[PDB]
Write a protein that holds these residues in place. Structure first.
Motif, PDB file in Angstrom:
ATOM      1  N   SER A 189       0.829  -1.146   0.077  1.00 19.65           N
ATOM      2  CA  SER A 189       0.157  -0.151   0.015  1.00 19.65           C
ATOM      3  C   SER A 189       1.053   1.271   0.083  1.00 19.65           C
ATOM      4  N   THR A 190       1.830   1.028   0.624  1.00 20.97           N
ATOM      5  CA  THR A 190       2.810   2.307   0.645  1.00 20.97           C
ATOM      6  C   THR A 190       3.949   2.110  -0.692  1.00 20.97           C
ATOM      7  N   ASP A 191       4.165   0.904  -0.915  1.00 20.19           N
ATOM      8  CA  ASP A 191       5.122   0.705  -2.019  1.00 20.19           C
ATOM      9  C   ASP A 191       4.235   0.040  -3.195  1.00 20.19           C
ATOM     10  N   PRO A 192       3.385   0.696  -4.032  1.00 18.96           N
ATOM     11  CA  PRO A 192       2.563   0.235  -4.870  1.00 18.96           C
ATOM     12  C   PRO A 192       3.125  -0.082  -6.238  1.00 18.96           C
ATOM     13  N   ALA A 193       4.428   0.525  -6.405  1.00 16.14           N
ATOM     14  CA  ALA A 193       4.932   0.524  -7.676  1.00 16.14           C
ATOM     15  C   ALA A 193       6.259  -0.629  -7.623  1.00 16.14           C
ATOM     16  N   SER A 194       6.138  -1.549  -6.499  1.00 12.75           N
ATOM     17  CA  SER A 194       6.916  -2.748  -6.400  1.00 12.75           C
ATOM     18  C   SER A 194       6.310  -3.774  -6.944  1.00 12.75           C
ATOM     19  N   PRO A 195       6.636  -4.255  -8.216  1.00 15.20           N
ATOM     20  CA  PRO A 195       6.031  -5.557  -8.840  1.00 15.20           C
ATOM     21  C   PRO A 195       6.295  -6.987  -7.996  1.00 15.20           C
ATOM     22  N   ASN A 196       7.614  -6.858  -7.579  1.00 19.54           N
ATOM     23  CA  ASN A 196       7.866  -8.032  -6.739  1.00 19.54           C
ATOM     24  C   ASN A 196       7.197  -8.363  -5.516  1.00 19.54           C
ATOM     25  N   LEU A 197       6.963  -7.247  -4.949  1.00 21.30           N
ATOM     26  CA  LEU A 197       5.802  -7.295  -3.751  1.00 21.30           C
ATOM     27  C   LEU A 197       4.634  -7.807  -4.022  1.00 21.30           C
TER      28      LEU A 197
END
Length: 158
Positions: free
Chosen positions: A124-132
């Motif tokens: 939710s804080t890192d929405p641009a992280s595809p691996n997450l």
């Protein structure tokens, strides 16, 4: 007004899951006495919903943090109903060896669901992280795995 239901849900899930896991797997035990098959069935119904709740985190992880919110909000809440049923039948286990065993299984899903939520929160804080997204899906798969594991054991396993 401020932006509602986006960060609350991800914490509220941990609130629900955490409290349930702590209060049910420790200290408090459901003294519900009656038929074992009732709690068995009650668990099964609950599990089917939580299976989708984990699925919701998966589908939402590839959408928006706002979807993750409602996914989190339900996941944590529905988990309570799941766990309350699981611990209930666990307390009806005649042999303490089996009783401790079924509780161990319950912990597996209780921990995994908690660990899953942490990935959703981070996403939710890192929405641009595809691996997450994949890490979330992996944790959700683990939760669903533990759910099915306990459900298989609640029934006569052959």
């Amino acid at each position: 007004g401020i932006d509602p239901f986006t960060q609350r849900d991800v914490d509220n899930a941990l609130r629900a899951v955490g409290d349930a896991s702590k209060r049910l797997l420790s200290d408090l035990l459901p003294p519900s006495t009656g038929t074992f098959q009732e709690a068995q069935s009650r668990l099964n119904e609950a599990a089917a919903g939580l299976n989708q709740a984990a699925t919701e985190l998966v589908q939402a992880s590839r959408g928006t943090p706002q979807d993750l919110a409602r996914a989190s909000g339900r996941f944590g809440q529905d988990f309570s109903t799941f766990l309350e049923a699981g611990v209930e039948m666990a307390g009806q286990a005649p042999s303490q060896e089996d009783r401790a065993q079924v509780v161990s299984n319950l912990k597996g899903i209780s921990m995994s669901s908690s660990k899953l939520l942490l990935a959703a929160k981070a996403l939710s804080t890192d929405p641009a992280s595809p691996n997450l997204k994949s890490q979330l899906a992996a944790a959700a798969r683990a939760v669903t795995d533990s759910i099915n594991q306990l459900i298989t054991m609640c029934t006569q396993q052959a």
